[PDB]
Symmetry: D2
Subunit: 481 residues, 4 copies
């Protein structure tokens, strides 16, 4: 076994250590070739054909770049080849838990199919990783390259999911190596190599000329002591670039990841999966059969759960799958559920997850006072609530970043928002509410618009942008508008 | 129905006429979302995740750009809006006939599964197009936008497949130039290549050196031997030689990558072993096989890269052998590359002889001590034709040019008027040999047979010949 | 006939023969010798680009937008004459720039000729007039169907604004034509679109804003009895992003602290050279660097070349100017001390800029200092950052249309878009530098600077606790 | 003090060792900010505003990348930090000798102004480098970072210009044979495959608006040092041979499209003409206040330091009546009243035009007797004849015959690969000449006449038929059966 070189369009030629190659050449990893990074986004942005596989390689590569850069500039950190390989492996493997169409699966499908369960792709990644290691005899190979499976497997899982009270909650590495936990999935502030890869890769595919300059950030990164931990610190000068990184993230969510049509296509696919869930069988361990919604309980079954489910349903002839198949066929003909509009709660108002189901009922209960041919019911409405933030709810992630200055490179400091600019956001979280109608004819749509705008007025939400055009009889009643 | 705008990473924001949108939003077109452009290339170049769908949009767009440019600069050509839409439709629809993993399907699988049949993706595209039109009531919609379905459907098909004396019925000789946009049968210079150069390069991580926007700006129609043809400005001749050089480079680096090809071969093998057991429902509920779905477009509509995963995730014992080959791909236990050579002789190895080659390699008698003896079935011999798109012919001899001082007068430019640094030949064959036995001793043996076979046949010395077979290469003084 | 030019940003661009005639003049070719980013090239070595190529791009984009509107809306009656006039204004709006672009009118002219009110825009109109008259362009304009009297006026108005409906070059039904090249209402114009893409390409920063997308969605609608360009409603987020990008590019590149100090040092050299450099203008009359703006024939010859003429001079009179430039070549630059901002209400006025080095030197930091610094040792640079319209939100001055009613213009407020947007649209940055570069001077400069920030109630410099640990504790507001 | 980071649009953020920063921050290096990489090319490709300065940084960076990669993969080579810095410095400093408008200066101007002298930008770079070091007290700073100035300065100069003595045997003194591979990085005298090309391919393409086909990062990953005929040399992986042929194809493409663009060349020619007419009157101050001319500034590095593209503007903005003729030529460039391109041809078969004959060519063109009615008669002085040598960097030789390869199964064993083992679609020849003819008389009747003379001359000499020959000279081309 020797190093392989791979040509990636984002990073160029990258070198992979043979242990990494061994982990990649498994069914559990190769699975990620059949899961679209952006899920239903490909149905809106035709360049977004990329899958989780190539993203994972990039994350693994960038994780290696950063840990090598720190070790070269600061030999006193005693970063070992063992540390480098463990960080790269965590980087490679943090996307292993994604399901069909990525965020569709755990953001929409699982919550509806298994409301009792608490599932995230991160937990899935840890379980899949364990299954990958055990199923393929990787532990001996790890030992052969100087890794200590007991500690290092724990370290890898902690890097992905966080600690499995205390000053130091981690067991895989001690406080003097704290900075290693900030590379792959940064729980403190969200600044990690996962974002850096997807910014560049998603932009390249989407046709958007945006990214964060990660090479710059790597050149200016240092490890300093912060409250008895050794942490990664950014050069003070870079603070503006970090605010820009979160702005870019939010832009990409607005333009692409939460595109109103990309979301409704995800919703339609989720609907098809719900109607197919009783009939599709996935074989897991010992020949046991699982459903789409229960394959998450057996990694051997989950290994075989990919975007392929979409086509299996679409190409089925079984009459049982007729309803699921019809929804997918509507997607192919582009007969989609119709977007009605968008609004936001005002100021500090927030809607909660428990209430999401009551919203279609509220919209249908509005009493516009316009002449309507058709009356709509709760089941005709879809109400999608989207949380937009800087990765930490209402918190400013830059308040959780440590910096150093050129005159004192070993001394960590904090920089507040007011020390940077007044042109920055005054809030770091908000909600968008999108309403769609499942009845697509002209009269239903007209009615849906009247209900929607009336509902906005009753709730004191913001005036939809086209409110005066879509509901000219409703908007005058609200003088605030 | 109004115009839609779509954001493509290669071309930016593209406008699509509502008739094109109607054609795109069908099962027959959306199918192309599930067919990788480069087939097994994705298993070597991880950026090559692109499908035929987005390439097709780009071809349709570029076809529109060129026909509009010609009309704007030369109103006397009388290009109509109807002509523009017909050219765009042919551009959109020329990839409709591709099968699972694109060139794998018609280059490898069909020739082995149905040796008696003569199938190309082009023929498939015309059949798929007909089925798309009829199944979705597109003819009325065509009429609504000023098209004449009888003549225009014929024109569209002719643009894709050629003629079904002026041999075309969809347009007359004064619109000859319209047949050169989408699939140029005369010299291969068409908008299909322009899109894939730029798109494949973007995804592969290689830089494209052909500038189609430049070419469009300098393109004119001129009279050539009583046809109106597209002519390039004389200055551009160098750039055209470069276009074919780029195509050849892309084939060498990516499309004929030795591992990408062997993955395609392994997938083909899995399909052959699955062909008796996979069922695809076509018209009237009739069942077809992977190899017969080409006979029914309703079945072919459902034949995509999904077949790979249906096999890989199957539990049926009948599919065990097919499933095992695909599992070898996932663990990267691939058939092993042995080497590459070329004929020195000017006769091309013929397609009819391809099957006899593994036998010849196994019949070589290398004078070397060997632990293991290999059989014909252990060898794969892949013959690859590399050319400038027209066998031995120089495609630039079939291009017409014009000069700045006389923009309507077509001229010819010969190779000697351009450069002495150009190719003296325009076609060649590469022969790759692989071994299905992957252990160290089998591979060592395979190398000895291979080099011996090269020597016996008077093929070129493999590049690593002296390293892989030091006992064999001395016997050939032509190599020393 | 038409010429084709290969531009790295826009690809192959077609130029109408009238445009080619305007380009092939000394007044336009001059722009080949003026760096777009001035002193920015001394920090970003990719930023070698000049005003010339930017001007070609602006002219091209202006043509793209006006063609797109005419094709989608024939009822606007956009003529070939209108298209050429818009392209010419686009080509010629950078004609008035001086040596190192914004250095010249942002730093040098204000200091050299404080009484005068000069902008590159005014310079562009004067240069344009001189270009036309000196080269016999009026007849050529007539030959392509232009009407010089009206159209020259239209071109100038597009660049500088009005020289009721205040414009004479075109009537209210063609109002939308005045929004293409230099948009006085909200700053959304093709000049920005070119520089975003060109500057990013050269600087090594990824250039946001998709102007092709914007062009596809642009329409003309009636707004308060004018025909104006309206954006599709869904594009409002992209417009906020466009201004965010602009502000980023200023923060990272155009107001780079070292780029700015190099501009300051070059300005200083020009001031010390101003009495001795002679530039021949009309009728053989001699001008100075600071007075060449009064004669276009002299101004034609005033480019980045002045830098090298000073640097390579042997005249003892130019010794002081030459020494400053030589310090730039050895990279013995004035040293950056830090940055701060005013707090709460406070805004620093232009009239007070000169008093600021005095104030910094007057601070009494309670720390032991080896050296005492004087006002002349400090440079204080005040930078106004905004979204192009002072305290105003430029998106409040944009008109939108919806898909369901394409001819009905609407307004969209900030609250209808996002709560993650800026609450303010203007601010000031204050950078302090020290002309004394040794270790002890620098240490002292830092103590003064932080003390001054404290006394004035400015924001705590980012590295305040590190550079002045004895000073920052005294301020509870800072912790 | 410490490393600086610089943002380059081609390579991204590059780290520079403090010694390199010291060399860069001198008048001798900063001079390269005022010299256009592509000379008169900017007057055709408006994106080509880049200067030699930023190219030099990129060459220095790539030289570092390659030497670091070799050292990391093969510790047994004993590459030291000292070796790395010396290679980077040679990379940074190999463009120091360029004059105004780069190749215009040493390709056109110097050969005409000082025909006796043998001047190349390479020689200029060595002299400039010596002057840079001595004028700025760099030797002590070198010592401070572990360099040994005597041997290392020699090594740096040898990397740029080749052996400084006649050895007639290992001809280099800066490093021994076991470090021979270090001499292949910056300026590869054996086959021309070096980091200088890699930077300019990527940079020129970025600025010109053309896409580059050569991947240097790939090449660096596959490069190894192996023993070849008792030297340690850089070897490429066997399967990279196709990419190397492509690299030379790309170089030839870039020359055809851009560097030898017919108008870019005539602008260079016009600027050269202006410089020749200005050469008696422009003064450049050198060492001790002595005055030099444009053509003699090459003899004093202090003067040469101040000789940049600025000369163009000094002439253009001059008022001295003595500079009137020079100034008028430059003004013609501004108004785009350029000498007119007449056409292009090539010698046939074996014919090779010699440098000594270049001056006789305008006479030959004017001596042609086209059998056509002409209103104007043209003289030798009305014609410019530009002869351009196009090749793969080594005259008639295939540079890939001078490359060593290794195979995956035996990484330490160097091998040769011949053209026939690669492809039949490759060039059969590796050198050729283009002949461009221009007319200084730009009116319609002169141009018509020039075309008739030119095509007649092609016919008389048996050169190739110009591409538009039948269009520009329909009465002349029929007389040549070889063309019909
Ligand atoms: N001219 C080429 C050849 C390959 N690649 C890409 C495809 C892969 O992502 C990566 C590695 O492919 P190689 O062909 O270099 O490697 P192999 O593994 O096929 O060759 P070997 O195992 O002989 O080294 O480089 C490329 O960009 N350009
Ligand atoms: N801010 C955006 C939004 C979308 N897109 C891309 C995705 C699509 O490929 C194309 C068109 O999407 P739009 O959202 O503009 O169009 P819709 O059809 O979704 O909206 P509508 O029908 O309301 O015009 O542009 C983009 O690049 N940037
Ligand atoms: N092979 C080429 C040649 C030129 N260009 C660029 C350089 C110019 O910016 C633009 C136009 O150059 P041309 O050589 O096409 O134009 P000329 O004016 O030299 O040719 P002519 O006057 O013969 O049309 O295109 C290019 O990209 N590729
Ligand atoms: N936000 C920024 C700032 C700078 N640069 C570029 C400009 C320079 O080419 C290089 C170095 O600039 P810095 O501002 O990082 O370096 P300084 O020397 O100005 O800062 P200091 O000396 O304080 O570290 O990076 C950049 O791309 N983005
Ligand atoms: Mg391999
Ligand atoms: Mg839509
Ligand atoms: Mg021309
Ligand atoms: Mg600095």
């Amino acid at each position: 076994d020797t190093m392989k070189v791979i040509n990636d369009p984002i990073h160029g030629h990258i070198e992979l250590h043979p242990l990494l190659v061994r982990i990649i050449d498994t069914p559990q990893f190769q699975r990620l070739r059949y899961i679209k990074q952006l899920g239903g986004g490909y149905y809106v942005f035709p360049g977004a054909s990329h899958n989780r596989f190539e993203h994972s390689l990039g994350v693994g590569y960038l994780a290696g770049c950063l840990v090598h850069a720190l070790g070269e500039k600061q030999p006193e950190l005693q970063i070992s080849e063992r540390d480098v390989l463990c960080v790269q492996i965590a980087g490679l493997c943090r996307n292993l838990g994604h399901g069909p169409f990525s965020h569709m699966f755990d953001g929409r499908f699982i919550p509806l199919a298994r409301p009792e369960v608490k599932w995230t792709h991160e937990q899935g990644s840890v379980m899949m990783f364990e299954h990958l290691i055990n199923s393929n005899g990787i532990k001996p190979v790890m030992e052969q390259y100087g890794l200590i499976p007991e500690e290092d497997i724990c370290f890898i899982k902690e890097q992905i999911v966080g600690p499995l009270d205390s000053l130091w909650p981690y067991k895989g590495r001690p406080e003097n190596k704290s900075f290693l936990y900030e590379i792959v999935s940064n729980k403190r502030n969200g600044i990690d190599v996962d974002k850096w890869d997807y910014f560049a890769r998603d932009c390249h595919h989407l046709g958007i000329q945006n990214n964060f300059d990660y090479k710059r950030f790597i050149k200016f990164a240092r490890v300093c002591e912060v409250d008895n931990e050794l942490r990664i610190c950014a050069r003070d000068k870079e603070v503006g670039n970090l605010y820009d990184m979160f702005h870019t993230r939010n832009s990409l969510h607005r333009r692409a990841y939460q595109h109103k049509v990309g979301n409704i296509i995800d919703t339609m696919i989720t609907d098809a999966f719900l109607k197919a869930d009783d009939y599709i069988e996935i074989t897991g361990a010992g020949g046991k059969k699982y459903r789409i919604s229960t394959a998450i309980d057996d990694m051997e079954a989950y290994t075989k759960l990919t975007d392929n489910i979409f086509l299996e349903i679409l190409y089925s002839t079984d009459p049982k799958l007729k309803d699921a198949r019809e929804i997918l066929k509507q997607i192919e003909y582009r007969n989609l559920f119709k977007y009605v509009g968008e609004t936001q709660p005002t100021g500090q108002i927030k809607i909660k997850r428990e209430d999401y189901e009551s919203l279609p009922k509220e919209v249908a209960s509005a009493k516009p006072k316009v002449l309507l041919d058709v009356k709509l019911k709760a089941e005709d409405f879809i109400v999608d609530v989207i949380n937009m933030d800087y990765g930490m709810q209402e918190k400013n992630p830059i308040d959780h970043v440590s910096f150093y200055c050129k005159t004192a490179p070993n001394r960590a400091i904090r920089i507040t928002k007011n020390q940077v600019s007044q042109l920055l956001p005054e809030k770091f979280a908000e909600q968008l509410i999108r309403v769609y109608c499942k009845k697509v004819d002209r009269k239903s749509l007209y009615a849906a618009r009247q209900y929607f705008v009336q509902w906005c007025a009753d709730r004191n939400f913001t005036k939809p942008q086209d409110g005066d055009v879509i509901a000219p009889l409703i908007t005058p009643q609200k003088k605030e508008w």
